[PDB]
Amino acid sequence: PYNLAYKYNLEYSVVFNLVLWIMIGLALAVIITSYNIWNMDPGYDSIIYRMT
Amino acid sequence: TGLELLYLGIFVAFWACMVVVGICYTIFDLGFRFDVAWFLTETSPFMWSNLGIGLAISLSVVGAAWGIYITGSSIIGGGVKAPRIKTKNLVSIIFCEAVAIYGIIMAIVISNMAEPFSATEPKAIGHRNYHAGYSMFGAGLTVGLSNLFCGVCVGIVGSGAALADAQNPSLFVKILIVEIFGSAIGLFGVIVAILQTSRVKMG
Amino acid sequence: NNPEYSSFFGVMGASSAMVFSAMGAAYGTAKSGTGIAAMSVMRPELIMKSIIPVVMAGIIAIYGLVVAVLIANSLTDGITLYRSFLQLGAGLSVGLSGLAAGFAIGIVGDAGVRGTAQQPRLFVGMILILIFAEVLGLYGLIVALILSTK
Amino acid sequence: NNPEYSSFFGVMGASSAMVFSAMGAAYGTAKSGTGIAAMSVMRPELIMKSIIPVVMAGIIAIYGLVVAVLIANSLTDGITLYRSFLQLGAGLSVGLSGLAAGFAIGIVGDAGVRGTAQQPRLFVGMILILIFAEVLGLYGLIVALILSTK
Amino acid sequence: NNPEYSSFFGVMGASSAMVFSAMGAAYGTAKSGTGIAAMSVMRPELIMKSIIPVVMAGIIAIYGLVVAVLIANSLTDGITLYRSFLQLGAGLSVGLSGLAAGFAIGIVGDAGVRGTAQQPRLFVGMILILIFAEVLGLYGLIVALILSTK
Amino acid sequence: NNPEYSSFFGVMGASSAMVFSAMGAAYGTAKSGTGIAAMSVMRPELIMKSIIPVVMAGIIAIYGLVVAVLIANSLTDGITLYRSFLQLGAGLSVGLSGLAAGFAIGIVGDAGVRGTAQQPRLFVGMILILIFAEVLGLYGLIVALILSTK
Amino acid sequence: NNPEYSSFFGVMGASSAMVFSAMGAAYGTAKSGTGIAAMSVMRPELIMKSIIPVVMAGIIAIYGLVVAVLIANSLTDGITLYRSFLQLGAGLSVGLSGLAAGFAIGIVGDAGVRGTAQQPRLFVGMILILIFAEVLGLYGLIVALILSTK
Amino acid sequence: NNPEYSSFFGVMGASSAMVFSAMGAAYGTAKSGTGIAAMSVMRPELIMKSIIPVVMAGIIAIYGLVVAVLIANSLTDGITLYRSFLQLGAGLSVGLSGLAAGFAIGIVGDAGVRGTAQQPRLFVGMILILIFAEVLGLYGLIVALILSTK
Amino acid sequence: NNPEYSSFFGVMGASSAMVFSAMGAAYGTAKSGTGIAAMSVMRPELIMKSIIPVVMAGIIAIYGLVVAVLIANSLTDGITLYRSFLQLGAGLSVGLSGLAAGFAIGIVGDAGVRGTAQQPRLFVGMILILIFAEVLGLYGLIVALILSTK
Amino acid sequence: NNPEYSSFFGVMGASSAMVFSAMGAAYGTAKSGTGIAAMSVMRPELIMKSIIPVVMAGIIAIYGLVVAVLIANSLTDGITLYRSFLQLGAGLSVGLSGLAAGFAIGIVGDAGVRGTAQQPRLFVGMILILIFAEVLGLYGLIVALILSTK
Amino acid sequence: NNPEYSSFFGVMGASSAMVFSAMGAAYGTAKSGTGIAAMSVMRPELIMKSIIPVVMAGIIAIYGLVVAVLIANSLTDGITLYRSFLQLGAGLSVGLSGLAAGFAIGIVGDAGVRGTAQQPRLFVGMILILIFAEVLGLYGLIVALILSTK
Amino acid sequence: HPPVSYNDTAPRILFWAQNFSVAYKDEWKDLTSLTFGVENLNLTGSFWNDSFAMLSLTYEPLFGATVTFKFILASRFYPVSARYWFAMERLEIHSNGSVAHFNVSQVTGPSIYSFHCEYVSSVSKKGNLLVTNVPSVWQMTLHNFQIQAFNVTGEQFSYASDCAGFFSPGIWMGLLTTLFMLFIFTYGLHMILSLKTMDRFDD
Ligand SMILES: *[C@@H]1O[C@H](CO)[C@@H](O[C@@H]2O[C@H](CO)[C@@H](O[C@@H]3O[C@H](CO)[C@@H](O)[C@H](O)[C@H]3NC(C)=O)[C@H](O)[C@H]2NC(C)=O)[C@H](O)[C@H]1NC(C)=O
Ligand SMILES: *[C@@H]1O[C@H](CO)[C@@H](O[C@@H]2O[C@H](CO)[C@@H](O)[C@H](O)[C@H]2NC(C)=O)[C@H](O)[C@H]1NC(C)=O
Ligand SMILES: *[C@@H]1O[C@H](CO)[C@@H](O[C@@H]2O[C@H](CO)[C@@H](O)[C@H](O)[C@H]2NC(C)=O)[C@H](O)[C@H]1NC(C)=O
Ligand SMILES: *[C@@H]1O[C@H](CO)[C@@H](O[C@@H]2O[C@H](CO)[C@@H](O)[C@H](O)[C@H]2NC(C)=O)[C@H](O)[C@H]1NC(C)=O
Ligand SMILES: *[C@@H]1O[C@H](CO)[C@@H](O)[C@H](O)[C@H]1NC(C)=O
Ligand SMILES: *[C@@H]1O[C@H](CO)[C@@H](O)[C@H](O)[C@H]1NC(C)=O
Ligand SMILES: *[C@@H]1O[C@H](CO)[C@@H](O)[C@H](O)[C@H]1NC(C)=O
């Protein structure tokens, strides 16, 4: 109507930092654990080593 | 590469995001909210001052520990078949701990001029306070890093000297010169730190 | 008056005094144990002889505990930022000096046990170097006291 | 009078003191079990001489449990910021200390299990090292019970 | 009254709890299966009873699921921060503890199954070892109950 | 009243809910395939009994597809933060649990298929392990279901 | 009325609807050329039988083309913001599903072409699972339809 | 009436295609070169018949040139942000599609060049797979054309 | 009316073009130089021929220079966003195209130099390949020749 | 009428004009050393005949020196953003071009110096290569001049 | 009057100026000492004749100190921003140049010590190379000086 | 819901608030109903001038008598940026031969752009607009405050600068401290996590 503001809420910094750091923590945790799981050793010991 | 991939990923992502936000701010004509003044002023100087105080011995002790262990492993490894070198090579660890001594005396010097105030707006805190905080933080960083690298250098040269000395017992007198030339930079950092923090008058 | 953020920093300092220092001690002990294994089979009589590194690791832990108790008694609701940052600095410095000393003692203890496993005369020598490790921790603790006054 | 986000730090402690402590146990009982796997063959009758590190891991898990429960029991809606910071600091410190202790106990257990397998008289001495790692656990607990009230 | 962004913490807590339990259980089953297959190449008569470890891994997953339902049942459109937040903490704690316990159970099961292939006596002892892993996940459970009521 | 930018979380919830299941299915299929290639290089007449792992891996895909269909069906324009937050949480949970299931199925299927190449008796036992893997995935769906109605 | 910025997201979806899809198919070929390179030399009589993986990896390009033209034609300057997020979701989600399918088809085709040189009876078996490697990709596509028109 | 940064996004696309497509082309040619070094060293009669992969790699570069010249001519001062977004999207899509096509073309070219150096009959087969890769590149181009005139 | 930072983007383009061209030419010259250095130990009589590759690298550098000076024939005080942005795009495109060229010429020369070493007959065909890489760089210049002038 | 922080960029230009360039020179010399000693072990008389790459690295450094001196002389307290940005661009361009030239010169010098110890007739050809890597740095200087006078 | 944050840039300039030069000198001396210690066993009677690179490495520390002394002397609590930016630029330039000189001197002395051990006649040649490293650092000094007196 | 606007020819001062309340002896009474549309406001003492704007709102008899509010604001050249920066500095209440004062803390920004805030009052749980003690008896609140004074081009509001910001000083302090601790922790974690055990025993 008269080109008013967005009515942004105070405490914006708190909620933003909260969301950002919790999300980063969860994403880094899942990435590193999944990386560990994907890289794992079967054995190349008896079942897998032998051929013919 | 076993796990440093994570570190490289974090580094690259952080700097790419920094470039992106910087250009996004610039072309949007929104540079008036990138107020470096606000960040540098509304942060109380006490945080910078105590960060400097901690670092000034943090880094010195880290360098000293690095030097002692890197020389210790070699001296004791060589002494197993050459017991005669066991006591002769104390000088390397003496020089390694000298950097810690220098670090702690610097901490004592910097720790003075810590008078609390009651100002709350930057105009009340004032130029003298801001200069004092910044200068002593910088001096702490300088002495810390200089002592760290001096410690690493003297540890390496002492390791080499100790390894070589087990072979021909007439070599130790011609390898301490590099050790002293190493300790020179450890002293240089101290004196530059003093030169920086000379004129602090916080209050 | 003072902000409400002020109580944060000081408390965090205490945590450091019981994380970082402790962690260093832990490493030390672990490494020493490995040494004992390599020495247990061949020179069995000197098992108790090598009680000296492990205790010399635990002492680092002790130091941390001291400072922690102190920073648990100087904490009050009405703390100015000055006190908070003093305490944070003390905690950080003591924790990191403990950590560095712990790494040094661990490596030196491995080397010491392995060296004595083949040369009795090396014994005293190893002890000497070990002292230079432990003392480093004390240096950190020093500034903690200097930061409970100024 | 006090912001709602004051709850944040507090209950994060009530999580962390548990979480990290469990991680430590997951290293104490696991790698020790891997060692007992090798021990079982050459002398299967020394399982009672090798059940120590797992009980140590359980003990540190109990430590994490009791600090986490006690801190959680002091929860309220109008908690002050000061109390919130106190609880977070205590929880984090005990959690990371437990993690470090678990690491040390696991490594030394894996070494000493097979060390005793090859060399019987190591056994008693092995216990000694474990006790010192356990001491670190105690120390973590102490700080939390110094931060619960004061 | 309450803000417009309350449920986020509760839902992410439930998600984190269940997902971490799933990851731990998947790892545990994978390691147990690897050990089972490696052992069974030589002696089929034992396979029917070597399956015990993977069973325990499943139990850890079960813990996660049950806890999840609680965080899902006390959610409404207008939650205050306090309640949903306690739910976040409970979820994080249970998930991470379950993940650690599953890791330990899996590695233990693989190592013990490998060991029992040639010494039939260890099996009884192996059971007890795995118990001292499972209870660690169960400790997480207890914490959840507390943060599911206050 | 309702923010205009609330549909984003729901869209992301659906996308995650199917994408992570797809990743899990792809991993499981690839691992089982590389296993059975070497399996069938030698033993030809069992080329059809060993199809259970790939079918079990496809269940992760069907879970992702059904949760995608349901999560998209209940979507609408005027979404309050309540339902969108629930939707995101549920999608994230199901997707990541499906990923865990995919990992477990792939590894176990490879090891067991390579093992059963030599000893037929193990074959039936293999399915039992795989069953538990499926059960884990089922839990990952179930929680999401409740969060799609609460 | 709605901010022009929302149109951003719409276009972004279109980009995805090509790029990732292409990448999937590309990796397929990027392995296939290897296999047939080391397969004709020992066995030149069936050169025209290792091109099925090529088409199985190339249909992903068709899927990407279809969804890309759909998103491109749906774009206009009067799109509501909710619809632009909707399109972004469809594009990203089909792109990642296609990438996963590309990974799977590439690895499984490598295994099949490698195994065919030693055992003809293996051929049909691989083709069976190849269908599954395609099916997961298609699953993503159907979601896009339910995500675009609605 | 329009922002001043509107052109920025456009010119980013004006670089993007002409970089990325070009990059892929270079890569392909590079690998082709080393393939020739491994082929004519023994059998040199296929020098002139093995030049096809190089031009097949340069085709993506000529495609990038065409898109770049179009986007250059389609840029004026009275532009609106919508078409600027469209141009950026088209540029990125062509660039990355060409990069993928170049990678695939190069890999298959190297592998099949070695394979045909050794064995003549593979030759015809090589060309088929290579064409598939090139088709993928062309497909990307089509998308951009739509986005340049929507 | 015009802003106070318009010239920054233009200047950065003018710099980046020369930088990336220089890096590409450096890589190409270095790789070709080490190639011919390794080559020359066997056949000195071909030396003056084998210098042809590096010559091509120099030509690419020349291209960069030209475009740079072009940008320095238009810089002035009151440049609108338009011209500076166009300079940025043109410079970046030419620079990265030069880098791609340099990479390709480097690898191709590296392989082909030894290739012609073992058999001189390859030589002429080799330079044929190299010319293709060169025209790649030329294309980049052409694009800038439309934008910097616009 | 002008901000003072406009001076910032200008001084930064000076630093680059002597920093990155300097780095390049250093690297070149180092590489030359690892050739030169490696060559003198058998043919000492050639030492004075293999210093040329080092003098060329010296010229590379001198370029950066002269441009930095000019840039510093141009500086003044009351500079408009125009001249400051020009200084920054010139410094960056010359510095990084010098870096690339030094890198190429270093690798080339090492390879050629090692090579010439066996085939003397290499000599003249080597120098040709060197000049083709020196002119690179020269081109940097040219563009910097055009930015300083303007 | 100047703004409040004037001295930060000058302080950090001096700090970096000393720190980076100390880094370079430490690296150079460490490497040179490594070479000397390695060489002493074979030909101890030349030790005095080979310490020259360490003496040259010290000059980097001297340059760092002199710039630090001047720059700290010029500092005052109320400088203008122009001056502080000159300070920062000079500090960065001298620090980076010193680091590069240290790298060069270290590697060259490392090669040269063994080279001289192989053949005495190398010596004078080595000296020349050393000069062409030392002067590089020297150049940096003078540039910084013009920046500090401006 | 129209805003109040001064009419020195083309309008110059614009102020709006979604809600507005004042209380004398801790007795809340809504005032938005009586303003922002009531053309009978005694907007007389208000005065405009290049680089000065005194906004005055005098209220007819209620709360005991007629009561006046006065919100001052002014802009000024800043050499450090070559711009014009504005702030509203003082709130003055005028009453029965008596006056009350209040600083202003954060309401500032470029003079080209309007300013917005969500809560501005002298009551806890929001936090703003307080002077050195003298508690007095005056409660004064606006919700959804917005203003522009110095470079309005008509009956409209320009771009709105908001007091929220992506960060606050305490957040930056905590973030830096946590970052330092985290770096140190991950260094220690790397060193401990690289530990490996032996493979076989002696003898
Ligand atoms: C907020 O409003 C205040 C009242 O109008 C402004 O003025 C400040 O009032 C303070 C209280 O009177 C003054 O402090 C005292 O001034 C007397 C003068 O005679 C001195 O002796 C005292 O030592 C001094 N006490 C102190 C500083 O503790 C302030 O000096 C006075 N300030 C000014 C600039 O006039 C406030 O300034 C205004 N803003 C702020 C940021 O407080
Ligand atoms: C401005 O704020 C006041 C105070 O909160 C609002 O008035 C309240 O309205 C509610 C809802 O009807 C009543 O329960 C309170 O008793 C009222 N208080 C007073 C002091 O009047 C008022 O409605 C707000 N104005 C608008 C337009 O929403
Ligand atoms: C608007 O407010 C002003 C300021 O209070 C009023 O001016 C006062 O008028 C009364 C009545 O004539 C005088 O006794 C006072 O001396 C005036 N005060 C000042 C400071 O000049 C003005 O009358 C009010 N206007 C209306 C229409 O009520
Ligand atoms: C301040 O002036 C006002 C306006 O006259 C007075 O306010 C009221 O005055 C009436 C009549 O005497 C009293 O009944 C009320 O109690 C007063 N208060 C209110 C809130 O209405 C007030 O008395 C004057 N204050 C003084 C002279 O100290
Ligand atoms: C101010 O004046 C303008 C121009 O005459 C008019 O349109 C507007 O309605 C007036 N506003 C008020 C609040 O009196
Ligand atoms: C009005 O503006 C003029 C011009 O800047 C200034 O001199 C004068 O002081 C201002 N009026 C008041 C009351 O300050
Ligand atoms: C305000 O607008 C006027 C009219 O265009 C202009 O002269 C002035 O520079 C603008 N800015 C300020 C800060 O007054």
Q: H or E element: which one contains K113? A: helix K81-118
Distances (CA, A) of E128 to D47, D61, E138, K69: 11, 17, 16, 70
Q: Taking Cα atoms as reference points, which of C68, C71, C63 lies closest to residue C87?
A: C71
Q: Which amino acid is at B107?
A: A
Rounded Cα–Cα distance for residues K135 and K141 (Å): 10
Residue G43 CB contacts under 8 Å (≥ 6 apart), including other chains: G116, G117
∠ CA C66-C71-C72 to the nearest 5 degrees? 95
Residue L51 is given by DSSP the state T
DSSP assignment of A1-50 equals -------PPSSHHHHHHHHHHHHHHHHHHHHHHHHHHHS----SSSTTT-
Rounded Cα–Cα distance for residues L19 and L5 (Å): 17
Do F37 and G126 lie within an 8 Å CB cutoff?
yes
- Residue among L1, L16, L19, L29 whose CB has most ligand 2 atoms within 8 A, to mutate: L19
Gap from G142 CA to chain H (nearest CA, Å)? 21
Residue L63 CB contacts under 8 Å (≥ 6 apart), including other chains: L22, L24, L29
What is the SS3 assignment for chain I? CCCCCHHHHHHHHHHHHHHHHHHHHHHHHHHHHHHHHHHCCCCHHHHHHHCHHHHHHHHHHHHHHHHHHHHCCCCCCCCCHHHHHHHHHHHHHHHHHHHHHHHHHHHHHHHHHHHHHHCCCHHHHHHHHHHHHHHHHHHHHHHHHHHCCC
Sign of the Cα torsion L160, L164, L167, L168 reads positive
Structure token pair of residue H55: 């031009």
Distances (CA, A) of D17 to B13, C61, D96: 31, 19, 8
Gap from K125 CA to chain J (nearest CA, Å)? 7
Rounded Cα–Cα distance for residues I139 and I136 (Å): 5
DSSP assignment of chain D equals ---GGGHHHHHHHHHHHHHHHHHHHHHHHHHHHHHHHHHHHH-GGGSTTS-HHHHHHHHHHHHHHHHHHHHHHT--TT--HHHHHHHHHHHHHHHHHHHHHHHHHHHHHHHHHHHHHH-TTHHHHHHHHHHHHHHHHHHHHHHHHHHS--
Do G122 and F14 lie within an 8 Å CB cutoff?
no
Structure token pair of residue B184: 């020179």
Q: Does the beta carbon of L138 lie inside 6 Å of ligand 4?
A: no
Structure token pair of residue F2: 């309702």
Partner residues linked to L145 by β-bridges: L117
Q: Report chain E residues whose CB lies below 8 A from the CB of F147.
A: 11, 14, 72
Rounded Cα–Cα distance for residues K121 and K132 (Å): 19
What is the SS3 assignment for chain J? CCCCCHHHHHHHHHHHHHHHHHHHHHHHHHHHHHHHHHHHCCCHHHHHHHCHHHHHHHHHHHHHHHHHHHHHHHCCCCCCHHHHHHHHHHHHHHHHHHHHHHHHHHHHHHHHHHHHCCCCCHHHHHHHHHHHHHHHHHHHHHHHHHHHCC
Do F93 and E19 lie within an 8 Å CB cutoff?
yes
Partner residues linked to L85 by β-bridges: L76, L110
Q: Taking Cα atoms as reference points, which of C96, C72, C107, C91 lies closest to residue C23?
A: C96
B58 → closest Cβ in C93, C107, C108 = C93
Three-state secondary-structure class, residue E20: helix
A5 → closest Cβ in L3, L116, L119 = L116
Burial class (CB in 10 A: 0-12, 13-18, 19+), J48: exposed
DSSP assignment of F47-79 equals TTGGGHHHHHHHHHHHHHHHHHHHHHHT--SS-
* In the block, residue with structure tokens 């005098």: L58
Rounded Cα–Cα distance for residues F51 and F28 (Å): 13
Buried residues in C7-34 as b, exposed as e (16+ CB within 10 A): bbbbbbbbbbbbbbbbbbbbbbbbbbbb
Q: What's the half-sphere exposure (Cβ side, CA atoms, 13 Å) at J114?
A: 18
> What does the CA dihedral F60, F64, F65, F67 come to, rounded to 10 degrees?
130
Rounded Cα–Cα distance for residues L38 and L20 (Å): 14
Rounded Cα–Cα distance for residues F12 and F32 (Å): 30
Q: Does the beta carbon of L144 lie inside 6 Å of ligand 5?
A: no
Spacing, Cα L155 to ligand 2 middle (Å):
29
Rounded Cα–Cα distance for residues J26 and J99 (Å): 9
Phi-psi region of C119 (alpha: psi -120 to 50; beta: other; left: phi over 0): beta
Residues of B with CB under 8 A from a CB of C: 44, 46-47, 49-51, 53-54, 57-58, 61-62, 64-66, 68-69, 72-73, 75-77, 79-81, 83, 86-87, 90, 93, 96-97, 100, 104, 107-108, 111-112, 114, 116
Residue I53 CB contacts under 8 Å (≥ 6 apart), including other chains: I32, I35, I36, I105, I108, I109, I112, I113, I127, I130
Is the pair J, C in contact (3+ CB pairs within 8 Å)? no
- D74 neighbors D148 (Cβ within 8 angstroms): yes
Taking CA–CA distances from B96, the nearest residue in chain C reads C132
Three-state secondary-structure class, residue L16: strand
- C55 neighbors D133 (Cβ within 8 angstroms): no
Phi-psi region of I9 (alpha: psi -120 to 50; beta: other; left: phi over 0): alpha
Residue D8 CB contacts under 8 Å (≥ 6 apart), including other chains: A18, D84, E85
Q: Does the beta carbon of L156 lie inside 6 Å of ligand 5?
A: no
> What does the CA dihedral H72, H73, H77, H81 come to, rounded to 10 degrees?
-70
Structure token pair of residue J68: 């930095």
Distances (CA, A) of L69 to C141, H78, L102: 59, 48, 11
Between strands L29-30 and L47-49, the pairing is unpaired
Do D69 and E108 lie within an 8 Å CB cutoff?
no
Three-state secondary-structure class, residue L95: strand
- Protein residues whose CB sits closer than 6 Å to any atom of ligand 6: L 49-52
Rounded Cα–Cα distance for residues E122 and D45 (Å): 9
- By residue count, chain D amounts to 150
Rounded Cα–Cα distance for residues D105 and J52 (Å): 62
Buried residues in I17-51 as b, exposed as e (16+ CB within 10 A): bbbbbbbbbbbbbbbbbbbbbbbbeeeeebbebbb
Cα F32 to chain centroid distance, Å, stands at 15
Rounded Cα–Cα distance for residues I140 and I59 (Å): 13
Rounded Cα–Cα distance for residues B145 and I104 (Å): 43
Sign of the Cα torsion H44, H49, H53, H58 reads positive
- I13 neighbors I81 (Cβ within 8 angstroms): no
Q: Taking Cα atoms as reference points, which of L171, L188, D94 lies closest to residue B58?
A: L188
Distances (CA, A) of F25 to F62, F97, F105, G56, I79: 10, 12, 9, 17, 56
- D38 neighbors E111 (Cβ within 8 angstroms): no
Distances (CA, A) of B46 to B53, B131, C61, J55: 10, 12, 29, 52
Q: Taking Cα atoms as reference points, which of D43, D64, D63 lies closest to residue D116?
A: D43
Sign of the Cα torsion C87, C92, C98, C101 reads negative
Partner residues linked to L86 by β-bridges: L75, L109
Do E37 and F111 lie within an 8 Å CB cutoff?
yes
Burial class (CB in 10 A: 0-12, 13-18, 19+), C41: middle
Cα H52 to chain centroid distance, Å, stands at 15
Structure token pair of residue G83: 């619809």
Residue H93 CB contacts under 8 Å (≥ 6 apart), including other chains: G14, G15, G18, G19, H140, H143, H144, H147
Structure token pair of residue E53: 């470890």
Partner residues linked to L115 by β-bridges: L147, L161
Rounded Cα–Cα distance for residues L183 and L185 (Å): 5
D58 → closest Cβ in E92, E125, E132 = E132
Q: What's the half-sphere exposure (Cβ side, CA atoms, 13 Å) at L118?
A: 14
H26 → closest Cβ in I100, I112, I115 = I100
Touching chains, C (3+ CB pairs < 8 A): B, D, L
D1 → closest Cβ in L124, L192, L201 = L124
- Ligand 4: residue whose CA is nearest its atom 16: L64
Q: H or E element: which one contains L71? A: strand L65-78
- Ligand 4: residue whose CA is nearest its atom 15: L64
Q: DSSP E strands: which ranges in chain C? A: none
Residue E4 CB contacts under 8 Å (≥ 6 apart), including other chains: F3, F81
Residue L42 is given by DSSP the state B
Rounded Cα–Cα distance for residues A16 and A27 (Å): 16
- D16 neighbors D90 (Cβ within 8 angstroms): no
Three-state secondary-structure class, residue L61: strand
Rounded Cα–Cα distance for residues I116 and J30 (Å): 32
Three-state secondary-structure class, residue E70: helix
Structure token pair of residue J1: 């009428």
Q: Which amino acid is at I33?
A: G
Q: Report chain D residues whose CB lies below 8 A from the CB of L124.
A: 1
- Residue among L90, L103, L129, L132 whose CB has most ligand 1 atoms within 8 A, to mutate: L132
Interface contacts (H, I; CB < 8 Å): 127
Q: Taking Cα atoms as reference points, which of E12, A35, G9, G101 lies closest to residue F13?
A: E12
- By residue count, chain I amounts to 150
> What does the CA dihedral E53, E58, E63, E66 come to, rounded to 10 degrees?
-160
Rounded Cα–Cα distance for residues J89 and K121 (Å): 46
Spacing, Cα I3 to ligand 7 middle (Å):
15
PDB resolution in Å: 3.8
Q: Taking Cα atoms as reference points, which of G130, G138, G131, G150 lies closest to residue G63?
A: G138
- Measured from the Cβ of residue F145, the count of other Cβ atoms closer than 10 Å reads 15
Phi and psi (nearest 5°) for L60?
Answer: -55, 170
Q: Report chain K residues whose CB lies below 8 A from the CB of J72.
A: 143, 146-147, 150
Do I93 and H15 lie within an 8 Å CB cutoff?
yes
Sign of the Cα torsion C20, C24, C25, C26 reads positive
